[PDB]
């Protein structure tokens, strides 16, 4: 055995390397940042008709102007989502204002290499999750990616999960910086339909759009049906 | 300042409490309930300092409820009175003592009706009848005079009315209405409020 804080001969912590591999097992999710707002879409990956599709919440609201897409170990993500919601409200309390998308992404990111055995108070291992933070602030619509290494970057378009390689390839061929939010939603749905084993439907996937003056919105089944129609 | 009364019969316990929630010189509420059901056959009537009372009574309630969930059966009025005492007496020498004066009424399937008196100091006494507050000074002697251990519930209700009528005639505090309840083999029964 070796410690959770052991470096590989290449300069990377073995536990962080393996946590990234866990994300390759999670549901595929896409985010697209547009001048008119950020779009978030995720496959639920339902395994039984008996399972309530509403009980799978892979797109969450952090605050009115920020949303989050997750992949990997769904239970590890629930802890970081709560840490993000608490953060925004402690900032609202102290400073009477909203946080930037980057500030929230950075706050969640600080908890990444906060794991260990000896000399600790007390996480044993990293979080096996990847997050996409899509929201709007004074800098306009912003979309951020974060992985178990605590590395966060700003993205025009990003895909995470099992079919990350393929979905990003498709995103690259269709993304333009001037693309409308209507075209952003369509591309994400077409790319999501392509990568999933099961057929796409209004009760099979989740879609959320954050636009200035409209706030964070989670698309209804009736809204998802109208989008899938086109 | 508040009023609690209990009269225990051969097979029941009758209890009453004022309905005033007061602050300073104003009567903020006329319909305030001071009894807390702990079990199906146990009531905790609690009087005292501003916050202390709801805080203490509800902590005991939730723990008596946790016992029911944990074990499948409820605490007896005796075990519930002694558990109330252990917590109050344990806070006595602590930074946060509770200024609560309470009465615990209840009916046990094996031991029958029981009425307990507890000091704010957490002295526990089993009494055939009891009263808390300044009103107890004007009514304990009425109860001494007419109370008998074979007192029927209909007769105890009449004896209770005489104690409450005495508070209207001589008590300087305006205690207009009172909550009335009987605990028996079939549980807690809400009776009509004694009003003036």
């Amino acid at each position: 055995d070796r410690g959770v804080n052991t470096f590989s001969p290449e300069g990377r912590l073995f536990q962080v390397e393996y946590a990234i591999e866990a994300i390759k097992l999670g549901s595929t999710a896409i985010g697209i940042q547009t001048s008119e707002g950020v779009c978030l879409a995720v496959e639920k990956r339902i395994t039984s008709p008996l399972m309530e599709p509403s009980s799978i919440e892979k797109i969450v609201e952090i605050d009115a102007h920020i949303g989050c897409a997750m992949s990997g170990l769904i239970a590890d993500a629930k802890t970081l989502i709560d840490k993000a919601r608490v953060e925004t409200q402690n900032h609202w309390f102290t400073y009477n204002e909203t946080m930037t998308v980057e500030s929230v992404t950075q706050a969640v990111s600080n908890l990444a290499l906060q794991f260990g055995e000896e000399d600790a108070d007390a996480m044993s291992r990293p979080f096996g999750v990847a997050l996409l933070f899509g929201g709007v602030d004074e800098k306009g619509p912003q979309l951020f990616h974060m992985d178990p290494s605590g590395t966060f970057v700003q993205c025009d378009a990003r895909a995470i999960g099992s079919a990350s390689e393929g979905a990003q390839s498709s995103l690259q061929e269709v993304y333009h910086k001037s693309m409308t939010l209507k075209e952003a939603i369509k591309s994400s749905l077409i790319i999501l339909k392509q990568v999933m084993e099961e057929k796409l439907n209004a009760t099979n996937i989740e879609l959320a759009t954050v636009q200035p003056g409209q706030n964070f919105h989670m698309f209804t089944k009736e809204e998802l049906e109208e989008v899938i129609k086109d | 300042m508040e009023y609690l009364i209990g009269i225990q019969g051969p097979d029941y316990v009758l209890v009453a409490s004022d309905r005033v929630a007061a602050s300073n010189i104003v009567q903020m509420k006329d319909d305030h309930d001071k009894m807390f059901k702990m079990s199906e056959k146990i009531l905790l009537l609690c009087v005292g300092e501003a916050g202390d009372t709801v805080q203490f009574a509800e902590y005991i309630q939730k723990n008596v409820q946790l016992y029911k969930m944990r074990n499948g059966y409820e605490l007896s009025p005796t075990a519930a009175a002694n558990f109330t005492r252990r917590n109050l007496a344990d806070c006595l020498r602590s930074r946060t003592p509770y200024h609560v004066n309470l009465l615990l009424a209840g009916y046990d399937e094996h031991e029958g009706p029981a009425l307990y008196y507890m000091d704010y100091l957490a002295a526990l006494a089993k009494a055939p009848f009891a009263a808390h507050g300044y009103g107890a000074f004007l009514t304990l002697s009425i109860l001494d005079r007419y109370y008998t251990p074979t007192i029927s519930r209909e007769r105890a209700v009449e004896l209770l009315r005489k104690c409450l009528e005495e508070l209207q005639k001589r008590f300087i505090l305006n205690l207009p209405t009172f909550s009335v309840r009987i605990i028996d083999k079939n549980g807690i029964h809400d009776l009509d409020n004694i009003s003036f």
Binding site: E61, V86, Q89, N90 | V26, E49, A50, G51, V54
Partner: protein
């Protein structure tokens, strides 16, 4: 201070005074003594100004955090119970705060009186502050559960107005809110001496 709130046929009326004082000096002629926690939940303030502002802003933060966690608004009973538990933790610390948690939830209109002692009362009529007795007198006299929204606005307006007249620690303006089924509406922010002068000139 003089805060008042009363349930009636058309919802809950909540009116506050606007005076802050330091001894006999008036530190602020107009201060907002109502925290708008959300479109359906308000809080009135009386007592120590810092305690009122900080503690009610802490309830608001916890209410907002509840909505993010559950996707539903907090109930009036949970928000009032939350505030009294905060007060309870600081028992004997010298906090001074009198508030009424007014709102509308799955169980209709809600009005609770919460105190620095941890008092938590549900009721259909309360009044807090150094001028509460004057407000109770006027309010009690003209209150009927079947009051028009405009008739209730006069009862709440006059109750605060007469309390600023007799209570030296009350004055400024009346800030009045009407709690309806689909949220509150700030009715008015009216100068109390202008009201008192209007009532004097009507004699």
């Amino acid at each position: 201070t003089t805060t008042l709130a009363f349930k009636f046929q058309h919802g809950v009326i909540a009116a506050v005074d606007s005076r802050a004082s330091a001894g006999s000096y008036i530190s602020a002629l107009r201060v907002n003594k109502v925290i708008e926690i959300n479109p359906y939940l308000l809080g009135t303030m009386s007592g120590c100004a810092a305690d009122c502002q900080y503690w009610e802003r802490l309830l608001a933060k916890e209410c907002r955090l509840y909505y993010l966690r559950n996707g539903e608004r907090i109930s009036v009973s949970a928000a009032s119970k939350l505030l009294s538990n905060m007060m309870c933790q600081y028992r004997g610390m010298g906090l001074s705060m009198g508030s009424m948690i007014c709102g509308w939830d799955k169980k209709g209109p809600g009005l609770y009186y919460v105190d620095e002692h941890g008092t938590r009362l549900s009721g259909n009529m309360f009044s807090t502050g150094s001028g509460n007795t004057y407000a109770y007198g006027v309010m009690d006299s003209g209150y009927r559960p079947n009051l028009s929204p405009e008739e209730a606005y006069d009862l709440g307006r006059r109750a605060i107005a007469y309390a600023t007249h007799r209570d030296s620690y009350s004055g400024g303006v009346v800030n009045m809110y009407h709690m309806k089924e689909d949220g509150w509406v700030k009715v008015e922010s009216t100068d109390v001496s202008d009201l008192l002068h209007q009532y004097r000139e009507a004699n």
